[PDB]
Amino acid sequence: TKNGRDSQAKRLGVKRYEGQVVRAGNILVRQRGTRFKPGKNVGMGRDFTLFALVDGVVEFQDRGRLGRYVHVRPLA
Amino acid sequence: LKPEELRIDVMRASGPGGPGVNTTDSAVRVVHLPTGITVTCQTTRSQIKNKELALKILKARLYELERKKREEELKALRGEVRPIEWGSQIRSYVLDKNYVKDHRTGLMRHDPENVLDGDLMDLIWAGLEWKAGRRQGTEEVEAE
Amino acid sequence: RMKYRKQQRGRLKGATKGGDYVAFGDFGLVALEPAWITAQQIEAARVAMVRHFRRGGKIFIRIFPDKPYTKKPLEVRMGKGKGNVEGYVAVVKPGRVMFEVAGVTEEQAMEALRIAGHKLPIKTKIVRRDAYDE
RNA sequence: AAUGUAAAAA
RNA sequence: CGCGGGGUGGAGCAGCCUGGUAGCUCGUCGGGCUCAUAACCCGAAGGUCGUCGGUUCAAAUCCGGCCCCCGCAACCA
RNA sequence: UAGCUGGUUCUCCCCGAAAUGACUUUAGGGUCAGCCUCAGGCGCUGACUGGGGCCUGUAGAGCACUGAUAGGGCUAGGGGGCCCACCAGCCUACCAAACCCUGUCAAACUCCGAAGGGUCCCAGGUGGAGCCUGGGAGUGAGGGCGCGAGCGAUAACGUCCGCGUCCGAGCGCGGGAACAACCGAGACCGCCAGCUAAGGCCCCCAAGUCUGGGCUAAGUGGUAAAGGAUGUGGCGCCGCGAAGACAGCCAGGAGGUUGGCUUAGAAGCAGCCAUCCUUUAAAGAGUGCGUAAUAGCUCACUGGUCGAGUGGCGCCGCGCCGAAAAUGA
RNA sequence: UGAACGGCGGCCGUAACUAUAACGGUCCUAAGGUAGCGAAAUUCCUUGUCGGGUAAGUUCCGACCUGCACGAAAAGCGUAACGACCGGAGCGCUGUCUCGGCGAGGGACCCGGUGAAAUUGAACUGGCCGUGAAGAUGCGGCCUACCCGUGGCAGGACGAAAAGACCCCGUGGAGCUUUACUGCAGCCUGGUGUUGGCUCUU
RNA sequence: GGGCAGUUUGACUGGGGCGGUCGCCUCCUAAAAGGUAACGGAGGCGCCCAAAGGUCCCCUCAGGCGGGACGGAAAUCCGCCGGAGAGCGCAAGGGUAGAAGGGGGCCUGACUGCGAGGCCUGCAAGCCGAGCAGGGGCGAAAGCCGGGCCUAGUGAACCGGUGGUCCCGUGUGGAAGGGCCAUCGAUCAACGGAUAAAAGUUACCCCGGGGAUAACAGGCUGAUCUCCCCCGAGCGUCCACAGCGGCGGGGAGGUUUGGCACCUCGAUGUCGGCUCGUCGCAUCCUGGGGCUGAAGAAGGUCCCAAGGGUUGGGCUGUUCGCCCAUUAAAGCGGCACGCGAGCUGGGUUCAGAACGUCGUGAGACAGUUCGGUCUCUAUCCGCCACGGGCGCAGGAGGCUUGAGGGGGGCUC
RNA sequence: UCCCCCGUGCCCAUAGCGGCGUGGAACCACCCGUUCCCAUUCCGAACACGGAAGUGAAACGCGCCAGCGCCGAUGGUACUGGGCGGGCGACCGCCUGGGAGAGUAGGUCGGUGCGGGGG
Ligand SMILES: [Mg+2]
Ligand SMILES: [Mg+2]
Ligand SMILES: [Mg+2]
Ligand SMILES: [Mg+2]
Ligand SMILES: [Mg+2]
Ligand SMILES: [Mg+2]
Ligand SMILES: [Mg+2]
Ligand SMILES: [Mg+2]
Ligand SMILES: [Mg+2]
Ligand SMILES: [Mg+2]
Ligand SMILES: [Mg+2]
Ligand SMILES: [Mg+2]
Ligand SMILES: [Mg+2]
Ligand SMILES: [Mg+2]
Ligand SMILES: [Mg+2]
Ligand SMILES: [Mg+2]
Ligand SMILES: [Mg+2]
Ligand SMILES: [Mg+2]
Ligand SMILES: [Mg+2]
Ligand SMILES: [Mg+2]
Ligand SMILES: [Mg+2]
Ligand SMILES: [Mg+2]
Ligand SMILES: [Mg+2]
Ligand SMILES: [Mg+2]
Ligand SMILES: [Mg+2]
Ligand SMILES: [Mg+2]
Ligand SMILES: [Mg+2]
Ligand SMILES: [Mg+2]
Ligand SMILES: [Mg+2]
Ligand SMILES: [Mg+2]
Ligand SMILES: [Mg+2]
Ligand SMILES: [Mg+2]
Ligand SMILES: [Mg+2]
Ligand SMILES: [Mg+2]
Ligand SMILES: [Mg+2]
Ligand SMILES: [Mg+2]
Ligand SMILES: [Mg+2]
Ligand SMILES: [Mg+2]
Ligand SMILES: [Mg+2]
Ligand SMILES: [Mg+2]
Ligand SMILES: [Mg+2]
Ligand SMILES: [Mg+2]
Ligand SMILES: [Mg+2]
Ligand SMILES: [Mg+2]
Ligand SMILES: [Mg+2]
Ligand SMILES: [Mg+2]
Ligand SMILES: [Mg+2]
Ligand SMILES: [Mg+2]
Ligand SMILES: [Mg+2]
Ligand SMILES: [Mg+2]
Ligand SMILES: [Mg+2]
Ligand SMILES: [Mg+2]
Ligand SMILES: [Mg+2]
Ligand SMILES: [Mg+2]
Ligand SMILES: [Mg+2]
Ligand SMILES: [Mg+2]
Ligand SMILES: [Mg+2]
Ligand SMILES: [Mg+2]
Ligand SMILES: [Mg+2]
Ligand SMILES: [Mg+2]
Ligand SMILES: [Mg+2]
Ligand SMILES: [Mg+2]
Ligand SMILES: [Mg+2]
Ligand SMILES: [Mg+2]
Ligand SMILES: [Mg+2]
Ligand SMILES: [Mg+2]
Ligand SMILES: [Mg+2]
Ligand SMILES: [Mg+2]
Ligand SMILES: [Mg+2]
Ligand SMILES: [Mg+2]
Ligand SMILES: [Mg+2]
Ligand SMILES: [Mg+2]
Ligand SMILES: [Mg+2]
Ligand SMILES: [Mg+2]
Ligand SMILES: [Mg+2]
Ligand SMILES: [Mg+2]
Ligand SMILES: [Mg+2]
Ligand SMILES: [Mg+2]
Ligand SMILES: [Mg+2]
Ligand SMILES: [Mg+2]
Ligand SMILES: [Mg+2]
Ligand SMILES: [Mg+2]
Ligand SMILES: [Mg+2]
Ligand SMILES: [Mg+2]
Ligand SMILES: [Mg+2]
Ligand SMILES: [Mg+2]
Ligand SMILES: [Mg+2]
Ligand SMILES: [Mg+2]
Ligand SMILES: [Mg+2]
Ligand SMILES: [Mg+2]
Ligand SMILES: [Mg+2]
Ligand SMILES: [Mg+2]
Ligand SMILES: [Mg+2]
Ligand SMILES: [Mg+2]
Ligand SMILES: [Mg+2]
Ligand SMILES: [Mg+2]
Ligand SMILES: [Mg+2]
Ligand SMILES: [Mg+2]
Ligand SMILES: [Mg+2]
Ligand SMILES: [Mg+2]
Ligand SMILES: [Mg+2]
Ligand SMILES: [Mg+2]
Ligand SMILES: [Mg+2]
Ligand SMILES: [Mg+2]
Ligand SMILES: [Mg+2]
Ligand SMILES: [Mg+2]
Ligand SMILES: [Mg+2]
Ligand SMILES: [Mg+2]
Ligand SMILES: [Mg+2]
Ligand SMILES: [Mg+2]
Ligand SMILES: [Mg+2]
Ligand SMILES: [Mg+2]
Ligand SMILES: [Mg+2]
Ligand SMILES: [Mg+2]
Ligand SMILES: [Mg+2]
Ligand SMILES: [Mg+2]
Ligand SMILES: [Mg+2]
Ligand SMILES: [Mg+2]
Ligand SMILES: [Mg+2]
Ligand SMILES: [Mg+2]
Ligand SMILES: [Mg+2]
Ligand SMILES: [Mg+2]
Ligand SMILES: [Mg+2]
Ligand SMILES: [Mg+2]
Ligand SMILES: [Mg+2]
Ligand SMILES: [Mg+2]
Ligand SMILES: [Mg+2]
Ligand SMILES: [Mg+2]
Ligand SMILES: [Mg+2]
Ligand SMILES: [Mg+2]
Ligand SMILES: [Mg+2]
Ligand SMILES: [Mg+2]
Ligand SMILES: [Mg+2]
Ligand SMILES: [Mg+2]
Ligand SMILES: [Mg+2]
Ligand SMILES: [Mg+2]
Ligand SMILES: [Mg+2]
Ligand SMILES: [Mg+2]
Ligand SMILES: [Mg+2]
Ligand SMILES: [Mg+2]
Ligand SMILES: [Mg+2]
Ligand SMILES: [Mg+2]
Ligand SMILES: [Mg+2]
Ligand SMILES: [Mg+2]
Ligand SMILES: [Mg+2]
Ligand SMILES: [Mg+2]
Ligand SMILES: [Mg+2]
Ligand SMILES: [Mg+2]
Ligand SMILES: [Mg+2]
Ligand SMILES: [Mg+2]
Ligand SMILES: [Mg+2]
Ligand SMILES: [Mg+2]
Ligand SMILES: [Mg+2]
Ligand SMILES: [Mg+2]
Ligand SMILES: [Mg+2]
Ligand SMILES: [Mg+2]
Ligand SMILES: [Mg+2]
Ligand SMILES: [Mg+2]
Ligand SMILES: [Mg+2]
Ligand SMILES: [Mg+2]
Ligand SMILES: [Mg+2]
Ligand SMILES: [Mg+2]
Ligand SMILES: [Mg+2]
Ligand SMILES: [Mg+2]
Ligand SMILES: [Mg+2]
Ligand SMILES: [Mg+2]
Ligand SMILES: [Mg+2]
Ligand SMILES: [Mg+2]
Ligand SMILES: [Mg+2]
Ligand SMILES: [Mg+2]
Ligand SMILES: [Mg+2]
Ligand SMILES: [Mg+2]
Ligand SMILES: [Mg+2]
Ligand SMILES: [Mg+2]
Ligand SMILES: [Mg+2]
Ligand SMILES: [Mg+2]
Ligand SMILES: [Mg+2]
Ligand SMILES: [Mg+2]
Ligand SMILES: [Mg+2]
Ligand SMILES: [Mg+2]
Ligand SMILES: [Mg+2]
Ligand SMILES: [Mg+2]
Ligand SMILES: [Mg+2]
Ligand SMILES: [Mg+2]
Ligand SMILES: [Mg+2]
Ligand SMILES: [Mg+2]
Ligand SMILES: [Mg+2]
Ligand SMILES: [Mg+2]
Ligand SMILES: [Mg+2]
Ligand SMILES: [Mg+2]
Ligand SMILES: [Mg+2]
Ligand SMILES: [Mg+2]
Ligand SMILES: [Mg+2]
Ligand SMILES: [Mg+2]
Ligand SMILES: [Mg+2]
Ligand SMILES: [Mg+2]
Ligand SMILES: [Mg+2]
Ligand SMILES: [Mg+2]
Ligand SMILES: [Mg+2]
Ligand SMILES: [Mg+2]
Ligand SMILES: [Mg+2]
Ligand SMILES: [Mg+2]
Ligand SMILES: [Mg+2]
Ligand SMILES: [Mg+2]
Ligand SMILES: [Mg+2]
Ligand SMILES: [Mg+2]
Ligand SMILES: [Mg+2]
Ligand SMILES: [Mg+2]
Ligand SMILES: [Mg+2]
Ligand SMILES: [Mg+2]
Ligand SMILES: [Mg+2]
Ligand SMILES: [Mg+2]
Ligand SMILES: [Mg+2]
Ligand SMILES: [Mg+2]
Ligand SMILES: [Mg+2]
Ligand SMILES: [Mg+2]
Ligand SMILES: [Mg+2]
Ligand SMILES: [Mg+2]
Ligand SMILES: [Mg+2]
Ligand SMILES: [Mg+2]
Ligand SMILES: [Mg+2]
Ligand SMILES: [Mg+2]
Ligand SMILES: [Mg+2]
Ligand SMILES: [Mg+2]
Ligand SMILES: [Mg+2]
Ligand SMILES: [Mg+2]
Ligand SMILES: [Mg+2]
Ligand SMILES: [Mg+2]
Ligand SMILES: [Mg+2]
Ligand SMILES: [Mg+2]
Ligand SMILES: [Mg+2]
Ligand SMILES: [Mg+2]
Ligand SMILES: [Mg+2]
Ligand SMILES: [Mg+2]
Ligand SMILES: [Mg+2]
Ligand SMILES: [Mg+2]
Ligand SMILES: [Mg+2]
Ligand SMILES: [Mg+2]
Ligand SMILES: [Mg+2]
Ligand SMILES: [Mg+2]
Ligand SMILES: [Mg+2]
Ligand SMILES: [Mg+2]
Ligand SMILES: [Mg+2]
Ligand SMILES: [Mg+2]
Ligand SMILES: [Mg+2]
Ligand SMILES: [Mg+2]
Ligand SMILES: [Mg+2]
Ligand SMILES: [Mg+2]
Ligand SMILES: [Mg+2]
Ligand SMILES: [Mg+2]
Ligand SMILES: [Mg+2]
Ligand SMILES: [Mg+2]
Ligand SMILES: [Mg+2]
Ligand SMILES: [Mg+2]
Ligand SMILES: [Mg+2]
Ligand SMILES: [Mg+2]
Ligand SMILES: [Mg+2]
Ligand SMILES: [Mg+2]
Ligand SMILES: [Mg+2]
Ligand SMILES: [Mg+2]
Ligand SMILES: [Mg+2]
Ligand SMILES: [Mg+2]
Ligand SMILES: [Mg+2]
Ligand SMILES: [Mg+2]
Ligand SMILES: [Mg+2]
Ligand SMILES: [Mg+2]
Ligand SMILES: [Mg+2]
Ligand SMILES: [Mg+2]
Ligand SMILES: [Mg+2]
Ligand SMILES: [Mg+2]
């Protein structure tokens, strides 16, 4: 019957959708690879995690052959 | 082992078990109707595994019953006798005086040295097959 | 064949793709009910078909068993079925064309297909090549 | 460091 | 069905765990001593490594399914 | 000692669960979370809804990837045959890589891709909504039903999850003959008042033996399948017909021919392979029976008579057979 | 060191028909089960096969041996006599039976005297077919049925009795076991106290 | 050092044991957020690397075709097509050449002191992280570096080891010994880890509980079993259905074996026999038919039909089955496998004992063998009989009608 | 405002593959050379410097062509929030709102922003 196995659920995916206000440093997206590329005011960590770089608003940009991007349009 | 031939019986088992043995028949009796040879089994708690084993057993015996009858019709064709002793021969090959001789056709010859090399045609053709089929061809066309 | 292992049962929902048209031969036999058709079924139909018209025309078979049909061996509840006792079946939603015939009189193919129907669990229909094409 | 059968004395 | 072991020259066994080259005894074959055979002496040949897949630069060797043989187990009511 | 079983005593009022998750020598026990309640505090935010933005890979479909797959084409490789050896050549109603055409399958395949769902913003929403801190809990065996999957056997009042829902705690009321969870509906108390819901309105039993148009002759209805049949009614299509059909009845129904071949025999009639003509108004190198092989009978087809319709096929409604069980229906 | 605990092989081949294998090959062991016995108080397949007995014999007796899984002091094989031991057969005799009948006495039954028990939710406690927690006097539909007792039968009241002994559960209990753990008694052991003198010796 | 003593001897589990499993990662199941179970389908981890790391600089795969001394499908060279099917240490997935991939120069940031704000979450854990300070590495610089393309490669606390320092030092000074910092000892793998330390047996057994859970029976189910149909390859010399029916297909029944675990564990007594039966019909006989490959007699096959009938022995506890002698036939099922408040108790299923077998052992066996306590009193329903009461719209004696039941039902 | 060219962005194939044609004044490229800076695991191929001559062959720039590639409706359908209705079921049917994929008709060899040189 050798089969009763699996591994923990990692609860990844988009953590902050477009339009949502965000504090600097808080996380935008956890992902397997780069299903989302960083972009303006958004850094990326060892696991490919995208995190806002300054208080602002999240917005997503698709750029075809160049992939999708997550941006934080600042304001204060 | 065609299903149409053998009959299978079910019946409670002899020996230990609890109420399970009394109320649950797991023993099996698979008799072969034509050959009459029967067989019974009940070594396992299950009816199917007994019905299964009792059948693999019957297979073995029915194979050994077909091998016995497979003997008379594949060994009686060899020869109804053949002592290999003295005089049991049917054709002598004398190398001293140089002469073979088929004691069946009474036919003779003068070259044992070549015959024991391939010259069987002269023998089988004219005389051999003749007397061979003769003793059976005169048996049917008269009384047999 | 190849694939891998055994496979979930799924469900025979509406005959959405469970429909078709003739694409080979003049006559065809289409299904009317959803069912898992066994290899032993497909074959028995196909053979009984030629068996009918000896040295006859040519038959086509458009359904093909790729689904492993499992089965536990007279016991209780452990693991997934060793299965495959009936081995393999083909999914058939009502409306799909299964068997094509060709190169025989109508009454010669109205019988061949009439029979292949019987060897099948479901109710089926025979068809002329209407006139609907692409 | 064994063995060698079975047809020959006017 | 469950757990364990095994399948390698014609016979019987090594080699595998630790992948790179398959070894032992017997038999077989050629040549010797003998009047001749055996014994004995000198040579030589012979193996899909059960089967289908997988890993690897590479599989007898490691991984998986199947067929075959062996042993154990099949208990409580 | 008892993580077990039993037992736990007056009344009225308000609210009102859980049978899930995580860990547990844990699995009928516990700790924390979830859900209930009370107190104080905040006060339009709450469920649900409108508009807008972003996130998604199911249903369906698809073959572009990973694989599976029927037929054909083209074509390496191998196999058989001609031919041979210096190796070369052609054939190939054998198997078949790649490729292409047609046709398809896939939870662990996706060029695509819904409905929907999630979340944030704005607005409606004062509700036994919501949020913050605390006191007290119980629950941690659920069950059925609808839907979506796994397991199972596209078995089980089976089993395991997901979204609902009802019983649990509404075995209170109405319907369903009776019957927790199906249909209707949330019982504060009283009334010999009224409208309804599901379901019903011939008698037991309240209310139409109501109205209009059909179908069904089985007690179907009053609970079963493949499959079988000149059941009955209905729409459609093709064909025959007063230039005479369908049915029955009068007559011929053949010649070479006894078809070639298989075979003991195969004379239209076991099987195999099949595509003449002619007397003529018509008769098929033959529908069935009869044979050992034939002759005999018949249809097919033509003539006459009759005198008005007839035959096949597709579709729908209801019905018939298929249909055997043990205390009395 | 075995009348100490204990143990006592596998595969393949070979015969003046076939079958078998006295013989051989090879691998492994500490050594590979000898005599005697053997479908047995041991045999799974099994009612093995053959013979005996019987009209007919899964038992029984005698054999054969492919001993699932005998075997030599947890003794092997026998053995006269003995046995309220266990199995098979026969003669005698029978109500054991075909198959039951009659008769006797002590109860049962009726009258007078004395007078219990388990049990008991309450009862105004019928049949069928359904139904319901899946086996209904108590729900539904239908059938049946005047009220109350006495002698009898045991199908039901999932009848009574005993908080199921079987099964599982409880980080329950207890008896037993050992090369489970940890201890203890006991036995062995060095130092030292009780413990002294003389002499040789390294 | 079991002579004796105190104890341990896990959990999950479509009953339990046996088998398997236990933590971590990948994918599917998962129903387009997240999450989601089963002893559901499939696979990996318990490491590795001082280059396989940092930075700067440069280069771009696999494959296909053509051409080339060894080469020969494939080594290395050249040309043309080729956007990623290669590579990224290792399972899978996501991602990726506008590098995360191949090569080179210098290099050690596989830094210390921190850490805004988050992800995830019952707890505790796990994860991401801009920037500030120190002193650095590569770069001209903008900058990048707090290991590795990413997600596994792991272990609370306790107890102890080694190194170090602003700490404490039992009247004071030292010392002993602690604290703090650093790091070490986990197949605590039953992987949230009971002790520093632990296996079996009970049929000699006991208590507490459970119909939360198995063995009997009922129930649901109908795989299995029995019976019956659809198709018609073929057999039957000729003739597919006299009699048969390949390969397939649809059902009925609830007698078998199972599945499930619904009532009953403050008890529903288990096999066989005996006694007494009653019901079903899918009919063994007898009665009536159709067909026949039915001359007749006798059969074969299907149809109708329960009214009655359906023997005695041998063997075994047997049911079953074999056998003997008959018969018109020696039917099959239901009724808790009908019936133990009716009987038996041979079998199963307590304690004794023995054999083979397994175990060091105590013991154990759907293996065997001999032995082994079956409970006088019927309240109610039901049943067999027999009375008392009242009724039957004057009272009484005798004789009767038959609604409605019951019995009988055989065959040579 | 206009035209050509250079550099650099924006969307991300209707921008691409390929076939034909045109451009050297300007710009760009190839191009001459390898002393110097720099460079090859060999080689001025690449990287680099110094640069006349020649050329527009290559590369690139612009423009045409629809064979490949790519884009691709409308109409209808599958599926489906929500609400119902029929059968033993494996299933099926209606109302309401949403609505694919494939395929048919067609479309495309691009559109634009900032700076600079030039008529
Ligand atoms: Mg799992
Ligand atoms: Mg992408
Ligand atoms: Mg970083
Ligand atoms: Mg037959
Ligand atoms: Mg027996
Ligand atoms: Mg026992
Ligand atoms: Mg027992
Ligand atoms: Mg039973
Ligand atoms: Mg039973
Ligand atoms: Mg084919
Ligand atoms: Mg079970
Ligand atoms: Mg297996
Ligand atoms: Mg002489
Ligand atoms: Mg061999
Ligand atoms: Mg080695
Ligand atoms: Mg070594
Ligand atoms: Mg040799
Ligand atoms: Mg030699
Ligand atoms: Mg020699
Ligand atoms: Mg030599
Ligand atoms: Mg040689
Ligand atoms: Mg191998
Ligand atoms: Mg073998
Ligand atoms: Mg063998
Ligand atoms: Mg065993
Ligand atoms: Mg066991
Ligand atoms: Mg057992
Ligand atoms: Mg036991
Ligand atoms: Mg036991
Ligand atoms: Mg026990
Ligand atoms: Mg209140
Ligand atoms: Mg309330
Ligand atoms: Mg507990
Ligand atoms: Mg709590
Ligand atoms: Mg508000
Ligand atoms: Mg997509
Ligand atoms: Mg789909
Ligand atoms: Mg394409
Ligand atoms: Mg592929
Ligand atoms: Mg691949
Ligand atoms: Mg060709
Ligand atoms: Mg070739
Ligand atoms: Mg050649
Ligand atoms: Mg060649
Ligand atoms: Mg050729
Ligand atoms: Mg899919
Ligand atoms: Mg996937
Ligand atoms: Mg859609
Ligand atoms: Mg929403
Ligand atoms: Mg108000
Ligand atoms: Mg409330
Ligand atoms: Mg509230
Ligand atoms: Mg609030
Ligand atoms: Mg509270
Ligand atoms: Mg609590
Ligand atoms: Mg719990
Ligand atoms: Mg539960
Ligand atoms: Mg529910
Ligand atoms: Mg449903
Ligand atoms: Mg399951
Ligand atoms: Mg299904
Ligand atoms: Mg169900
Ligand atoms: Mg409750
Ligand atoms: Mg409620
Ligand atoms: Mg009730
Ligand atoms: Mg009523
Ligand atoms: Mg109800
Ligand atoms: Mg009620
Ligand atoms: Mg209710
Ligand atoms: Mg309604
Ligand atoms: Mg009514
Ligand atoms: Mg019906
Ligand atoms: Mg039906
Ligand atoms: Mg019907
Ligand atoms: Mg029908
Ligand atoms: Mg008919
Ligand atoms: Mg006409
Ligand atoms: Mg006219
Ligand atoms: Mg007519
Ligand atoms: Mg007439
Ligand atoms: Mg005539
Ligand atoms: Mg006539
Ligand atoms: Mg004529
Ligand atoms: Mg005619
Ligand atoms: Mg005539
Ligand atoms: Mg003719
Ligand atoms: Mg004629
Ligand atoms: Mg005649
Ligand atoms: Mg129709
Ligand atoms: Mg119709
Ligand atoms: Mg009938
Ligand atoms: Mg009855
Ligand atoms: Mg000795
Ligand atoms: Mg021994
Ligand atoms: Mg032994
Ligand atoms: Mg021999
Ligand atoms: Mg020795
Ligand atoms: Mg022995
Ligand atoms: Mg004896
Ligand atoms: Mg015996
Ligand atoms: Mg015997
Ligand atoms: Mg045994
Ligand atoms: Mg025996
Ligand atoms: Mg026996
Ligand atoms: Mg016998
Ligand atoms: Mg005999
Ligand atoms: Mg006898
Ligand atoms: Mg005898
Ligand atoms: Mg006897
Ligand atoms: Mg023997
Ligand atoms: Mg023997
Ligand atoms: Mg033996
Ligand atoms: Mg055996
Ligand atoms: Mg055994
Ligand atoms: Mg034995
Ligand atoms: Mg022995
Ligand atoms: Mg001994
Ligand atoms: Mg003795
Ligand atoms: Mg004696
Ligand atoms: Mg005595
Ligand atoms: Mg005695
Ligand atoms: Mg006597
Ligand atoms: Mg008697
Ligand atoms: Mg008396
Ligand atoms: Mg008395
Ligand atoms: Mg007395
Ligand atoms: Mg008295
Ligand atoms: Mg009464
Ligand atoms: Mg009934
Ligand atoms: Mg009820
Ligand atoms: Mg009730
Ligand atoms: Mg009752
Ligand atoms: Mg009621
Ligand atoms: Mg009643
Ligand atoms: Mg009555
Ligand atoms: Mg009395
Ligand atoms: Mg009495
Ligand atoms: Mg009674
Ligand atoms: Mg009594
Ligand atoms: Mg009773
Ligand atoms: Mg109890
Ligand atoms: Mg424990
Ligand atoms: Mg001591
Ligand atoms: Mg001493
Ligand atoms: Mg001492
Ligand atoms: Mg002393
Ligand atoms: Mg002393
Ligand atoms: Mg010790
Ligand atoms: Mg000890
Ligand atoms: Mg179960
Ligand atoms: Mg179990
Ligand atoms: Mg056990
Ligand atoms: Mg276990
Ligand atoms: Mg899981
Ligand atoms: Mg592994
Ligand atoms: Mg690397
Ligand atoms: Mg480059
Ligand atoms: Mg290639
Ligand atoms: Mg090439
Ligand atoms: Mg080449
Ligand atoms: Mg080449
Ligand atoms: Mg070459
Ligand atoms: Mg060379
Ligand atoms: Mg080669
Ligand atoms: Mg080459
Ligand atoms: Mg190249
Ligand atoms: Mg080229
Ligand atoms: Mg790419
Ligand atoms: Mg690819
Ligand atoms: Mg790679
Ligand atoms: Mg890698
Ligand atoms: Mg990947
Ligand atoms: Mg890029
Ligand atoms: Mg590198
Ligand atoms: Mg690099
Ligand atoms: Mg390097
Ligand atoms: Mg900060
Ligand atoms: Mg933080
Ligand atoms: Mg936390
Ligand atoms: Mg906590
Ligand atoms: Mg930083
Ligand atoms: Mg700094
Ligand atoms: Mg950083
Ligand atoms: Mg790396
Ligand atoms: Mg990196
Ligand atoms: Mg790297
Ligand atoms: Mg990840
Ligand atoms: Mg501690
Ligand atoms: Mg400090
Ligand atoms: Mg001091
Ligand atoms: Mg000092
Ligand atoms: Mg420190
Ligand atoms: Mg371990
Ligand atoms: Mg644990
Ligand atoms: Mg542990
Ligand atoms: Mg403790
Ligand atoms: Mg320990
Ligand atoms: Mg432990
Ligand atoms: Mg004892
Ligand atoms: Mg005790
Ligand atoms: Mg219960
Ligand atoms: Mg439980
Ligand atoms: Mg029972
Ligand atoms: Mg019951
Ligand atoms: Mg039927
Ligand atoms: Mg035949
Ligand atoms: Mg025939
Ligand atoms: Mg069926
Ligand atoms: Mg039953
Ligand atoms: Mg059952
Ligand atoms: Mg239960
Ligand atoms: Mg349950
Ligand atoms: Mg009770
Ligand atoms: Mg009782
Ligand atoms: Mg009994
Ligand atoms: Mg009984
Ligand atoms: Mg009759
Ligand atoms: Mg007759
Ligand atoms: Mg006759
Ligand atoms: Mg006759
Ligand atoms: Mg006759
Ligand atoms: Mg007669
Ligand atoms: Mg009839
Ligand atoms: Mg009948
Ligand atoms: Mg009898
Ligand atoms: Mg007889
Ligand atoms: Mg008779
Ligand atoms: Mg008879
Ligand atoms: Mg009879
Ligand atoms: Mg029956
Ligand atoms: Mg009976
Ligand atoms: Mg009973
Ligand atoms: Mg039963
Ligand atoms: Mg019984
Ligand atoms: Mg009794
Ligand atoms: Mg009894
Ligand atoms: Mg009793
Ligand atoms: Mg007794
Ligand atoms: Mg008995
Ligand atoms: Mg006995
Ligand atoms: Mg017993
Ligand atoms: Mg006991
Ligand atoms: Mg005992
Ligand atoms: Mg037994
Ligand atoms: Mg006994
Ligand atoms: Mg008594
Ligand atoms: Mg009662
Ligand atoms: Mg009663
Ligand atoms: Mg009467
Ligand atoms: Mg009567
Ligand atoms: Mg009567
Ligand atoms: Mg009667
Ligand atoms: Mg201008
Ligand atoms: Mg050209
Ligand atoms: Mg130049
Ligand atoms: Mg120089
Ligand atoms: Mg210079
Ligand atoms: Mg320089
Ligand atoms: Mg320069
Ligand atoms: Mg040019
Ligand atoms: Mg170009
Ligand atoms: Mg033009
Ligand atoms: Mg185009
Ligand atoms: Mg549309
Ligand atoms: Mg249905
Ligand atoms: Mg359905
Ligand atoms: Mg729409
Ligand atoms: Mg579209
Ligand atoms: Mg283009
Ligand atoms: Mg533009």
Swiss-Prot record, chain A:
GO-annotated cellular components: cytosolic large ribosomal subunit
One Gene Ontology MF term: structural constituent of ribosome
Organism domain of life: Bacteria
UniProt-recorded name of the protein: Large ribosomal subunit protein bL27
Keyword Ribonucleoprotein in annotation: yes
Signal peptide range: none
UniProt organism field: Thermus thermophilus (strain ATCC BAA-163 / DSM 7039 / HB27)
A Pfam family annotated for this UniProt entry: Ribosomal_L27
Family of this protein: Belongs to the bacterial ribosomal protein bL27 family.
InterPro entries: Ribosomal_bL27, Ribosomal_bL27_CS
GO biological process entries: translation
Keywords, ordered alphabetically: Ribonucleoprotein, Ribosomal protein
Gene3D superfamilies recorded: 2.40.50.100
SUPFAM superfamilies assigned: Ribosomal L27 protein-like
Curated annotation (Swiss-Prot), chain C:
Protein name: Large ribosomal subunit protein uL16
Family designation: Belongs to the universal ribosomal protein uL16 family.
Coiled-coil region list: none
GO MF terms, alphabetically ordered: rRNA binding; structural constituent of ribosome; tRNA binding
Alphabetized SUPFAM superfamilies for the sequence: Ribosomal protein L16p/L10e
CDD domains per the UniProt record, alphabetical: Ribosomal_L16_L10e (cd01433)
Cross-referenced NCBIfam families: rplP_bact
Gene transcribed to yield this protein: rplP
Keyword vocabulary terms for this entry: Ribonucleoprotein, Ribosomal protein, RNA-binding, rRNA-binding, tRNA-binding
Pfam families per record: Ribosomal_L16 (PF00252)
Quaternary structure note: Part of the 50S ribosomal subunit.
Function: Binds 23S rRNA and is also seen to make contacts with the A and possibly P site tRNAs.
UniProt organism field: Thermus thermophilus (strain ATCC BAA-163 / DSM 7039 / HB27)
GO cellular component annotations of the record: cytosolic large ribosomal subunit
